[PDB]
Amino acid sequence: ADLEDNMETLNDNLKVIEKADNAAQVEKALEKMLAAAADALKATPPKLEDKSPDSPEMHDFRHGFAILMGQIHDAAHLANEGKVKEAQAAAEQLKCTCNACHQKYR
């Protein structure tokens, strides 16, 4: 997928995570978000469409996804040990990373 449709996947599964009932559902959504994030890693955002692959802006852009994946990874562990409530909270806490990247490059 491309950046935008990777972003919609993150956003739609985050939504699924909010209104989830059991652990299994959070894990699946988390997994999908992890894949989306992985796929976004290699994209160039319009705001830096001019700028080169090797610019400090693109390194920092790629870094944001590094953070995001690590966060999803951990949240998924919480899902896998049955701890639904804290998984959902960890998912909520992702927004701090989403917004940080948007603010700079969106």
Add this chain to the structure above:
Amino acid sequence: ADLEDNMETLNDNLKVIEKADNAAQVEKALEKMLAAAADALKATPPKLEDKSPDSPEMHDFRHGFAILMGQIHDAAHLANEGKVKEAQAAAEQLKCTCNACHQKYR
């Protein structure tokens, strides 16, 4: 140090990080926060003073610091590669972890 004084160290160095000018200063403050966090790992918070070392609440309490240290660790790398602005932002993004723990156990 004790829990409370560990907490004040985190809070005071976070404040130092906000109003910092160069990379070196952020790194030092970050380092101090990392130490404070490490020290807090083993404390029992008043709200769980009743509860045992092995309760799922104390595991989740200890887990919060595991998150926090990892976050500081990464933010410090940013400080060490001269990237002041993004280090400061990563420091701000810690607040999501602070508040998450306060909410449950403070």
Add this chain to the structure above:
Amino acid sequence: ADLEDNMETLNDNLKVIEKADNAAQVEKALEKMLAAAADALKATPPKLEDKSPDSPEMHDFRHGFAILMGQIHDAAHLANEGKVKEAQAAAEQLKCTCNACHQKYR
């Protein structure tokens, strides 16, 4: 790319990292490995070609790359702060993760 060619990229850049001279070269190789790893995340290995997307084997398979990317992510920070020698060592220490996965699913 496909799994095999993703694997050769990891292996060839690891080799580049061994015999590197400056920081910039390690960072580039590390970046490439990170991308390769991200790409591998979604593959099904022949040994589990029978088994479903949702099997505990495929979860543990995906988990191995989650580890690997996090490790590359940190090693790259070391590359970015000029610390060549320790970056190279962190790269060598990846082999423990490579071999762990091979052992089970290769």
Add this chain to the structure above:
Amino acid sequence: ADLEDNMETLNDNLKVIEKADNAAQVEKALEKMLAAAADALKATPPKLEDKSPDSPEMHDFRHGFAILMGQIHDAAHLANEGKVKEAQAAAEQLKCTCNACHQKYR
């Protein structure tokens, strides 16, 4: 505790993890190792007893424990989701970090 007796705790619990039978036992040992590692964070190793708190050697020394804790943290999650065998393997995979630090500063 001091460095040496922190090191014996890591080593004795690693031993406990090898010869463990159930998940609960691995988790406890892992927890103890996490605490030991946290406690070691602030020590000065004899080989750098001369050198200052702020030397690049002491930063790299402290970094090694950052890596180690993150690794234990993840291994403990595996313990907490009942996956004994892979927890034990993750514990084994710690040795790559132990040895890396010994080699440079022991």
